[PDB]
Design brief:
Four copies of one chain form a homotetramer. Chain A has about 325 residues and is of the alpha/beta class. Chain A is built from ten helices and 15 strands. Chain A folds into two domains: about 160 residues, NAD(P)-binding Rossmann-like Domain (Rossmann fold, 3-Layer(aba) Sandwich), CATH 3.40.50.720; about 170 residues, Lactate dehydrogenase/glycoside hydrolase, family 4, C-terminal (L-2-Hydroxyisocaproate Dehydrogenase, Chain A, domain 2, Alpha-Beta Complex). In chain A, strands 4-3-2-5-6-7 form a six-stranded parallel beta sheet. The first copy, chain A, has a three-stranded antiparallel beta sheet with strand order 8-11-12. A three-stranded antiparallel beta sheet of chain A has the order 13-14-15. The complex binds the ligand COc1cc(OC[C@@H](O)[C@@H](O)[C@H](O)[C@H](O)COc2cc(F)cc(-c3ccc(C(=O)O)cn3)c2)c(Cl)cc1NC(=O)CSc1ccc(C(=O)O)cn1 (4 copies). Chain C: It is found in: Cytoplasm.
């Protein structure tokens, strides 16, 4: 008799099915930062990794597995073949091509043309969380290819940039980012919209204390805080070659709202046709209620007409780009 | 329109189907300790509480709900009606009768509770904590109709944690690093498996062959004695115990909810193993995961340790033979 | 020869000094709720409990200790003598006195603090004091006056829980988690507390701007009643289970987290606010306070209406009047 | 009036002093893995990073800082100047030189010693009372080096040693047995790497000796070849390096576990490298992994594992070998 059989008597003959499974697609720096952040938050009972770089993929799986003693996620699997991803509650897309342009978008679209059908094949009921850049466009692409209802296709959107904003705000005010509130909405990147009217500590409107807030006439140049947010990815890439930890943490926080059905409000990109004056099939970041069914509700933020037009402009540019894509 | 609708545009017709729901039956000091321990370990997306004292029940629910901001368990519900427990993955029974013929009244209690539980959560695991726990776990099992892997008694889980704590005080290292197993029938008849006690793989019995005997100058036998009495001592001091039992139950909930397949000293239907031939529940090292107990470790026992477990089997069966459901 | 010495080679002598010790005074339901919450959030490397009911005390300690395997707080101690509390970073006061009369009730709590607070200060000169005992604003004043600590190191839990309740109820009406609902209750703890309607918001969207009637008696939705619900909820729960424990426990653990981790988060807690919010007297009220390893280091100056400002002035007069009549 | 003063009234002049500060030296993949693991277990109220590559250092600091919203460590600081590490409770050394073509392994070690000769005095100067946790390889030798350079008492100089390899061993044990690593117990002791000692006698689940169930356990005559599990442990770093070019996540998790025992004074028992002269029959000043009680004063106690004659022979041999290399180093 084998030692295992001498030691342990099997009483139950049982099967598989994971109950809180999460898949990360793409094991680059971003994918793996999402992975370790999720593992250390105890968000999943099974974690699947997939990539096309099979050695890298296997090496990352093994490195995570060796840390089992220290985690509470009993199963970590990987493979080039998407069957490893079966029955995921949530699938996180961090795959992309790397730096032309617009031809860069099409190559990412071609990457998605392969990934997304495979994901939906083995997890017809998952939530899709897209992190790949450009995220608003790629999230729309995942949505179109997947055939999912819009509530289940989510883009990381402005979630990290709002967190950065709050950190910088916290630096200026001498309080933790947790206590500093402010929203960056709309199109992820240089065109994102800092909603000066919403910024506050303990319910106290900064814009009201300080009417020049966010304008060129602002002696304190709060406008530059937003630009610092917009530039920070660029600045960090410049220093270390990429970013990982913050985006990883931010993605894990979204996963928490989903897997625990918290219905917290996050600034993430959702298909918002019919809201905010927008008439195109596009994804923009607005405050969304996030739960076990993905995005079920959207907060309607009161915007200035300047903010509204800026949001409509992003929709039209996003749509303009989406028309040139081949599916 | 209502302020909610001015503030919030609804995009989805929301079905609330709980995914990782846990129920605690009985909101006494034990149930509520299990509750707060589970809430603070983030093991459920929904907690249900059930009891027959409706005022107490509603008040406890409300008190937990009020701490929502500090928790990550978005839904907490309660009621005397078991519809509130629907679709639980795990249901924890702390219900018990007010003070033999007690077990009979506890059995009567279980005759009402269990079918109500099974009706609303057909697929749940059952974790019995009520005393006498090995007997009531057998009752829960029989009444429930469930296969044996899905019915679990807290058994010697806590007493083992107590033993390791006391081991750690004597040796000067954390209980986590002191290993020792109390098995068999919960209570005074439980078995201190001297041979398995160790730190870092070093057998204490081999270092100290007198370990656990009368001739032991260090009197380690009194450590098991102290574990078996400790509950009585705490009740004497504060009227009941709560925190330790609550923490130990949350630990089991954790292995279940996260499918960890850790080994715990808990009470399982072990007919067929350890020389036992009756439908009884005794604590052995069990692999605990999303399907309950799926495997048990076969501990190498001395001939008298063996005879002691068999005696408890016949003891329990003897008591079970009287009960009626 | 001894087994321990056979198993274990000792290399280092004991210099055992606590690095992040918390004491909870009072092991009633509130006290133990704070203790269990603190233990399960790993805020302390040593916990001490003190009370005068010595059986109950020892019993609570042992029960906690039996849970060690499942905790990461290696040392739990207790005693009637305050030497067990020495070198606490944080000492939490939940002790209280058990239809006549109010002022006479307060005085007997003062009497308890006259015994407790000096004992705490003697053994933990550098600690922060966090008072939870009712009425908390007054009793936080008494702890401050008695202890002789600077005001930054004496904190009352104040309206911290009530704000948390307010956000929970806000969340139930709006269909989102309380974490994402923001509202502030300030001022005197209890039914004199002030709901600051102008700061209530989700995602920076002002509810009052959306709904100008918010919190007036001219509100078809009666949001004013949410504050009342908050105010009443404590006594409703008391009506139902005899007391409250779990939420106040978690509330206090949250404050302990900001202090022990120096988070400088903002909480609505009771601070000596003479010289702010138009308050002239030595009075403790709840305002949004920056909370960290040195206690309360900063206060957020909320913009209040003249009515709201008047409410706080009134409470300051009430509290000051009562304190005027206390025997220290 | 500045918006901040308009919004916030300052009641206290702050002289900030960190209470549970951890420093990580070296922001390579290993350093940042320790760093993220520590941050997500809330073990420090301040984290400091140091390295010689200033851009890389600043980038990593900023990336972590941008995650502040999701963390409960209010202060992350970095700099090439060791003033940023002042008053750390724990300083974790992951700095190393990488081989060339080229140079012998001794010349690679000496270049690491050269690195430590610059780092260790800087660390000791700003945090005289810290514990040192050395992770850099070869770990037993470089932990010896930090001990000697720092002048710290031995209880305060700790090498990660066989901690991770024992974790790997329990994981692989759990895969064969169908049980979580948490419930599989087994110890890799002695010199980190090839010459480490799998202590078969101590392997168990639930206190059931595997060796007693299966006396061939760990022998060549073992038909189940459990020795191959030790070889797996020994080769796992190389195997992972072949696939992804380095390891990070596991060693990072294992380091934070040690950090946890130290910062919380847990007095858990870990397989880590300590100065064991005078114990285990060792006559030399060397560091070997044995089961150590780890707390706020570092390693206060070691467990005395009963070893077979051939196990004792391996350790004493490793001692000679380490001491031999040590005598060849320039301090
Ligand atoms: C290249 O092909 C593939 C690559 C894959 O690997 C993806 C991954 O490894 C790489 O994206 C890489 O590691 C980058 O680092 C990650 O870049 C990201 C990803 C991300 F989600 C977010 C950010 C980000 C966001 C915000 C900020 C900030 O705000 O700070 C910073 N960073 C950066 C996978 Cl899994 C499949 C395919 N493809 C296949 O499945 C085959 S089909 C196909 C079709 C076409 C092509 C082709 O044309 O190339 C290739 N394959
Ligand atoms: C009484 O009726 C009922 C009471 C109920 O209340 C339950 C609860 O509140 C009480 O158990 C109370 O909190 C006890 O104190 C808790 O005692 C326990 C419970 C437990 F699980 C473990 C321990 C324990 C273990 C180890 C240690 C240690 O080792 O340290 C210490 N402690 C102690 C419920 Cl939910 C339903 C019914 N019944 C109904 O559903 C109606 S049907 C019915 C039938 C018959 C009878 C009757 O005959 O009376 C009554 N009802
Ligand atoms: C009786 O004396 C003492 C009693 C002591 O026991 C304390 C404790 O066990 C009891 O407070 C018990 O647990 C209460 O129930 C808890 O009630 C509380 C306590 C609290 F902090 C907050 C809340 C609260 C807050 C908000 C909400 C909500 O908003 O929901 C709900 N609840 C409720 C101690 Cl440690 C020392 C002395 N005293 C001594 O040290 C001797 S000196 C002395 C002097 C005078 C007197 C005398 O006048 O009698 C007595 N002793
Ligand atoms: C180059 O010099 C320096 C390098 C430094 O490097 C920091 C960092 O970036 C690098 O360690 C890099 O990331 C490595 O790759 C990481 O490699 C490691 C490190 C480690 F701790 C453990 C493991 C490990 C363990 C187990 C397993 C497994 O079991 O799985 C896998 N991996 C792998 C620093 Cl902060 C200062 C100096 N130097 C100075 O301070 C100036 S003094 C000086 C003296 C001499 C020399 C010279 O000779 O060159 C240079 N400087």
């Amino acid at each position: 008799a084998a030692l295992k059989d001498q030691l342990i008597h099997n009483l139950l003959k049982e099967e598989h099915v994971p109950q809180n499974k999460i898949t990360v697609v793409g094991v680059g720096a971003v994918g793996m930062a999402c992975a370790i952040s999720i593992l250390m938050k105890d968000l999943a009972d099974e974690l699947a990794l997939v990539d096309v770089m099979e050695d890298k993929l296997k090496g990352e799986m093994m490195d995570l597995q060796h840390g089992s003693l220290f985690l509470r996620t009993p199963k970590i699997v990987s493979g080039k073949d998407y069957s490893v991803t079966a029955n995921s509650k949530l699938v996180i897309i961090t795959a992309g091509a790397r730096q032309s342009r617009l031809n860069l978008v099409q190559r990412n679209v071609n990457i998605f043309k392969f990934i997304i059908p495979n994901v939906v094949k083995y997890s017809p009921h998952c939530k899709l969380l897209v992190v790949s850049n450009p995220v608003d466009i790629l999230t729309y692409v995942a949505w179109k290819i997947s055939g999912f209802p819009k509530n289940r296709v989510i883009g990381s959107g402005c979630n990290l940039d709002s967190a950065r904003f709050r950190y910088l705000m916290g630096e200026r005010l001498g309080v933790h980012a947790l206590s500093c509130h402010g929203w960056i909405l709309g199109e992820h990147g240089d065109s994102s919209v800092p909603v000066w009217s919403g910024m506050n500590v303990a319910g106290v409107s900064l814009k009201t204390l300080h009417p020049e807030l966010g304008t060129d006439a602002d002696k304190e140049q709060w406008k530059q805080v937003h630009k610092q947010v917009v530039d920070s990815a660029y600045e960090v890439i410049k220093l270390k070659g990429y970013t990982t930890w913050a985006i990883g943490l931010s993605v894990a926080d979204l996963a928490e709202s989903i897997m625990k059905n918290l219905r917290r409000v996050h600034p993430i990109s959702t298909m918002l046709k019919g809201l905010y004056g927008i008439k195109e099939d596009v994804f923009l970041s607005v405050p969304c209620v996030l739960g076990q069914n993905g995005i079920s509700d959207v907060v309607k933020v009161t915007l200035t007409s300047e903010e509204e037009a800026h949001l409509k402009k992003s929709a039209d540019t996003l749509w303009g780009i989406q028309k040139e894509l081949q599916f």
